């Protein structure tokens, strides 16, 4: 389907409404590492079983949270290219499932958003690193660390100052304990953006003060549930304030080299000084390695979704064409 456009009416409004009640999971319902998508599925902005089309995801993040269009397009098509089924146009927001349809040939995995190292990655705030056995479920110990950092740096609330401190701690925790810790290219960028999302989109839009209370935080992160009478943000936004998080503790992209406490900077990795390189490497290396020699129908689907991905890329970058034009 074509990427949806921006909201016609982007005002704050009740999104926990009669048409979108929270419901508990049924057997087979899929939830994954993203509390935003999880909450939209659990309120029926997305299909409640957690399998959706890219267009459904873009409409849901806009309607439910006032996520901005360009950010919605970039993240959705990036996720779908590496984790979704390009022939059926379906993506799981969590585990791999037969519900995304017949699989493409190896080495493509169509693993859902749970797939480690495609979109999902290390030093998540409330989810453990994949090396420790579970990269998708809410983790109470990690959430209690978020509450502690909110008490120490946010007066009890999560805000961008807390984000800056927590983001760093999680990186340092992974360096100290995960011998396979990877923090380069796509993950490097998205990890920082994700820490702003609670302060920008989980805060009731009638306040929009960037101060997230811990009751609301737990509701979204653990139960995929909007607070009672939750109003969405009063304007489209995504990662505004990521500059504050980075400035708190500037880091170079890099990885542990098979041992703990061996963080080695990767000079081939993109960083905030090279955002177009991040896009080019995602397409020429990540997507191309999953689909090195696609058949006619897969090539067409890839090129279509790569065009859609480029719509979400900030002005100034050149489109790359791994399968030609
Ligand atoms: C637009 C499409 C979206 C996609 C494809 C997407 C995908 C993902 C994925 C795969 C992760 C896991 C990364 C990781 O931590 O390892 C993630 C994390 C996250 N997402 Fe989303 N997301 C989207 C939109 C949103 C929205 C609209 C919100 C908030 C309203 C949101 C909030 C978050 C948060 C807070 C995390 C971090 C969880 C943590 O570190 O504990 N996302 N997202
Ligand atoms: C992709 C970095 C995450 C930062 C959080 C804000 C979301 C913006 C989505 C990306 C839009 C432009 C991406 C690009 O120019 O490569
Ligand atoms: C836009 O939405 C607001 C509340 O969310 C509502 O008051 C207003 O009537 C709407 N405008 C249009 C275009 O219907
Ligand atoms: C280890 O890191 C590599 C990339 O460096 C990744 O492909 C692999 O899935 C990682 N394994 C775990 C469980 O972290
Ligand atoms: C949660 O994270 C903690 C701290 O990293 C870890 O020790 C624990 O094994 C994880 N899982 C659960 C189920 O608590
Ligand atoms: C976070 O809240 C605390 C206490 O109110 C404050 O010290 C800090 O400056 C706040 N940060 C932001 C971004 O408002
Ligand atoms: C991506 O591939 C295109 C050719 O399709 C090339 O022009 C560009 O330099 C490549 N970028 C990277 C980072 O490899
Ligand atoms: Cl928008
Ligand atoms: Mg993760």
Curated annotation (Swiss-Prot):
GO MF annotation terms: heme binding; metal ion binding; peroxidase activity
Record carries keyword Heme: yes
Reaction equation(s) it catalyzes: RH + H2O2 = ROH + H2O
Glycosylation sites: 9, 139, 159, 180, 284
Binding-site positions, heme: 34
Cofactor section: heme b
SUPFAM superfamilies: Cloroperoxidase (SSF47571)
Assigned protein family: Belongs to the chloroperoxidase family.
Function statement: Aromatic peroxidase that oxidizes aryl alcohols into the corresponding aldehydes and then into the corresponding benzoic acids. Oxidizes toluene and naphthalene. Catalyzes the regioselective peroxide-dependent hydroxylation of propranolol and diclofenac to 5-hydroxypropranolol and 4'-hydroxydiclofenac. Catalyzes the regioselective peroxide-dependent hydroxylation of naphthalene to 1-naphthol or 2-naphthol via a naphthalene 1,2-oxide intermediate. Catalyzes the regioselective peroxide-dependent oxidation of pyridine to pyridine N-oxide. Halogenates monochlorodimedone and phenol.
Protein name: Aromatic peroxygenase
Species per Swiss-Prot/TrEMBL record: Cyclocybe aegerita
Protein's gene: APO1
């Amino acid at each position: 389907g074509l990427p949806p456009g921006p909201l016609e009416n982007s005002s704050a409004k009740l999104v926990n409404d009669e048409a979108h009640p929270w419901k508990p999971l049924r057997p087979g319902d899929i939830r994954g590492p993203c509390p935003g998508l999880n909450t939209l599925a659990s309120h029926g902005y997305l299909p409640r079983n957690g399998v959706a089309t890219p267009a459904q995801i873009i409409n849901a993040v806009q309607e439910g949270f006032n996520f901005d269009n360009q950010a919605a397009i970039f993240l959705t098509y990036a996720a779908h290219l590496v984790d979704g089924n390009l022939i059926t146009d379906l993506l799981s927001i969590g585990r791999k499932t037969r519900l995304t349809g017949p699989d493409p040939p190896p080495p493509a995995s169509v693993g859902g958003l749970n797939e480690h190292g495609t979109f999902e990655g290390d030093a998540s705030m409330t989810r453990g690193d994949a090396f420790f056995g579970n990269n998708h479920d809410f983790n109470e110990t990690l959430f209690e660390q978020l509450v502690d950092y909110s008490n120490r740096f946010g007066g009890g609330k999560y805000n961008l100052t807390v984000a800056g401190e927590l983001r760093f701690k999680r990186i340092q925790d992974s360096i100290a304990t995960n011998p396979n810790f990877s923090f380069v290219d796509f993950r490097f960028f998205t990890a920082y953006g994700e820490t702003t999302f609670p302060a920008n989109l989980f805060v009731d839009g009638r306040r929009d003060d960037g101060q997230l209370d811990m009751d609301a935080a737990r509701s979204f992160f653990q139960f995929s549930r909007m607070p009672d009478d939750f109003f969405r943000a009063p304007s489209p936004r995504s990662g505004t304030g990521v500059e504050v998080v980075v400035q708190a503790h500037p880091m170079q992209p890099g990885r542990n080299v098979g041992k703990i406490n061996s963080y080695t900077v990767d000079p081939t990795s993109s960083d905030f000084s090279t955002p177009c390189l991040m896009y080019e490497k995602f397409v020429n290396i990540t997507v191309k390695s999953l689909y090195p020699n696609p058949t006619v129908q897969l090539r067409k689907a890839l090129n279509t979704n790569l065009d859609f991905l480029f719509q979400g890329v900030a002005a100034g970058c050149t489109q790359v064409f791994p399968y030609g034009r």
